[PDB]
């Protein structure tokens, strides 16, 4: 869940 | 009569619900595909 991992998700 | 009109507005309200959620469709569509090239963009 790296930063643009969790950007993407949100 | 009544029976005429609603036939005729039944046919009507068929093929615009119909149309509608091909448009809706299209958008969830969009929505995934979205998410998809994004997952491109970060894997590939």
Same mark, same amino acid.
């Given at each position: 869940?790296?930063?643009?991992?969790? =950007?993407?998700?949100? | 009569?009544?029976? #005429?009109?609603?036939? +005729?507005?039944?046919? !009507?309200?068929?093929? =615009?619900?119909?149309? #509608? #959620?091909? +448009?809706?469709?299209? +958008?969830?569509?969009?929505?995934?595909?979205?998410?998809?090239?994004?997952? !491109?963009?970060?894997?590939?």
């Amino acid at each position: 869940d790296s930063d643009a991992s969790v =950007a993407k998700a949100k | 009569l009544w029976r #005429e009109k609603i036939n +005729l507005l039944n046919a !009507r309200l068929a093929e =615009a619900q119909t149309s #509608e #959620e091909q +448009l809706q469709s299209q +958008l969830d569509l969009q929505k995934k595909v979205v998410s998809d090239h994004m997952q !491109r963009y970060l894997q590939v």
